[PDB]
Amino acid sequence: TVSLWETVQKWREYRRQCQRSLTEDPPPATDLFCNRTFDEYACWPDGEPGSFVNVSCPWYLPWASSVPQGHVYRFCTAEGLWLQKDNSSLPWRDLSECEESKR
Amino acid sequence: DLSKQMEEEAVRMFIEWLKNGGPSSGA
Ligand SMILES: CCCCCCCCCCS[C@@H]1O[C@H](CO)[C@@H](O[C@H]2O[C@H](CO)[C@@H](O)[C@H](O)[C@H]2O)[C@H](O)[C@H]1O
């Protein structure tokens, strides 16, 4: 099923649920952690220092049912900052598992 | 259908816009 209108509405619902999590999820155990965030594509929880953070492929994607173990990744440095680059800024993110294509 | 195939591209463009930072920056 192809609908721009339906996909935008699913994104808005994902965004609304994400905002609810960002506001209401309890703080981490420790004071060292990378901070939760909505990057417009995926919802990120607080990260554990020195760790990869994996979240499910966003379920608004028209092809989400094709990738239902796929993850998107970030890396939380040692440190409590999201791994970036920066050349330039924006955290490193791997979303290859959530891509539409075969091949 | 040309129109449905074009709507499918529009949607892929919308997803690309999100990956590029959406309402925050976006392209
Ligand atoms: C420079 C290269 C170094 C790479 C280091 C390798 C470790 C990084 C892994 C990223 S976080 C890791 O991802 C997993 C999701 O892919 C996550 O596992 C999940 O999915 C699994 C898929 O095998 C599934 O079998 C498990 O039931 C499920 O727990 C895992 O929790 C997470 O730590």
Non-local CB neighbours of B6 within 8 Å, separated by 6+ positions? none
Q: Domain A1-103 carries which CATH code?
A: 4.10.1240.10
Q: Is A30 in the pocket of ligand 1 (CB under 6 A)?
A: no
Non-local CB neighbours of A64 within 8 Å, separated by 6+ positions? A57, A58
Structure's resolution in angstroms: 2.3
Looking from the CA of residue A53, the nearest atom of ligand 1 is: 11
Q: Whose CA is nearest to atom 17 of ligand 1?
A: A54
Contact B21 A61 (CB under 8 A): no
> A27: closest CA among A40, A10, A12, A46?
A46
Method by which the model was determined: X-ray
Helical pair A4-24 and B2-19, crossing angle rounded to 10 deg: 20
Domain ranges of chain A: 1-103
